[PDB]
């Protein structure tokens, strides 16, 4: 009926199956965690600034954003409103990302973000 039908073949989909992310704790500011690509639409029309979209996240975590590098290439950037601390406890969170083109294409995916403990500098507060 529909499930048997290859619905994916006759529709546009993102390049690089989603989705994983991993950075060395919150040590690097504004450093991309992972990059994802989108298949070129037949229309190939340009998209407005702020490529769609972050719909949800697994709490408690605030330090991520979407960076549209160009055309159909983008990556998630770390260190936003607040920084992430390993000592807090949580090390992984899933981000529900919604993707929409100008033509009206749609796709929802989950992006896991991992936090890795980073060693403090040899010099610092005594
Ligand atoms: Ca740590
Ligand atoms: Ca630390
Ligand atoms: Ca450490």
Curated annotation (Swiss-Prot):
Changing residue 92 to A: Complete loss of interaction with human rhinovirus C. It is found in: Cell membrane. Residues 15-122 form the Cadherin domain. Expressed in bronchial epithelium from adults and in fetal lung tissue. It comes from the Eukaryota. Cadherins are calcium-dependent cell adhesion proteins. They preferentially interact with themselves in a homophilic manner in connecting cells; cadherins may thus contribute to the sorting of heterogeneous cell types. (Microbial infection) Acts as a receptor for human rhinovirus C. It is linked to Asthma susceptibility may be associated with variants affecting the gene represented in this entry in early childhood asthma with severe exacerbations occurring between 2 and 6 years of age. (Microbial infection) Interacts (via N-terminus) with human rhinovirus C capsid proteins VP1, VP2 and VP3. This is Cadherin-related family member 3. It comes from Homo sapiens (Human). The lineage of its organism: Eukaryota, Metazoa, Chordata, Craniata, Vertebrata. The gene is CDHR3. The chain holds residues 21 to 130 of 885 of the full protein.
């Amino acid at each position: 009926m529909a499930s048997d039908y290859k619905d994916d073949d006759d529709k546009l989909h993102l390049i690089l199956l989603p989705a994983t992310g991993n950075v060395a704790e919150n040590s690097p500011p504004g450093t991309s965690v992972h990059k994802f690509s989108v298949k070129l639409s037949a229309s190939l029309s340009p998209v407005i600034p702020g490529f769609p979209q972050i719909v949800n996240s697994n709490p408690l975590t605030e330090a991520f954003r979407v960076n549209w590098l160009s055309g159909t290439y983008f990556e998630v950037v770390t260190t936003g409103m607040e920084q992430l601390d390993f000592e807090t406890g949580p090390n992984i969170f899933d981000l529900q990302i919604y993707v929409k083109d100008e033509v009206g294409v749609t796709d929802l995916q989950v992006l896991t973000v991992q936090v890795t403990d980073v060693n403090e500098p040899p010099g610092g507060t005594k």
